[PDB]
Design a protein. Structure first.
Lengths: 98, 99
């Protein structure tokens, strides 16, 4: 498997060549157009939506933080989290702790 | 690997350039903003929140004891520990290996 999975709960998932996009602006925009989320993954100051990824160590990390070259190497799969899923994640951490 | 992971249970992880900070006060403030914990890791006495890290030798250690220069090259990842997670760390493997 050369292609990376892009998933959104309730949508049919997709597979992309992350490396073919050469930056996060290009990546994020393409993903927003694919799932009909125009402006939501490219505005952290207004939107509660997160574009996350699972890496080689199975860690859920936010897309954007790392140098692109590192990212392209670590990335195992991508997921779009809605403001609701982010709170569902928080509550599941509380379930884990209790 | 060049940036350091910052993690919190029930939260989406992050990655920071540890070197882009002059001191621990700066490191702690950035992490607090990123995870919405303003004043929890800086004043720990009244919070119980611990900012831990994993060094090159795979050891879990409290962030802030070592000279900043030393820390910078030893850190592998940072983890934010909530007061509950702290209590849970004591709990069972010693009784497993013993028996």
């Amino acid at each position: 498997r050369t292609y990376t999975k892009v998933q959104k709960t309730g949508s049919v998932g997709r597979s992309i060549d992350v490396t073919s996009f050469k930056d996060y602006e290009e990546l994020k925009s393409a993903i927003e157009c694919m799932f009909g989320l125009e402006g939501l993954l490219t505005h952290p100051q207004s939107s509660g939506w997160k574009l996350v990824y699972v890496d080689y160590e199975s860690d859920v990390l936010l897309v954007g933080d790392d140098p692109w070259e590192e990212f392209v190497g670590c990335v195992r799969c991508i997921r779009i989290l809605s403001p609701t899923e982010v709170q569902q994640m928080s509550e599941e951490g509380m379930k884990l702790l209790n």
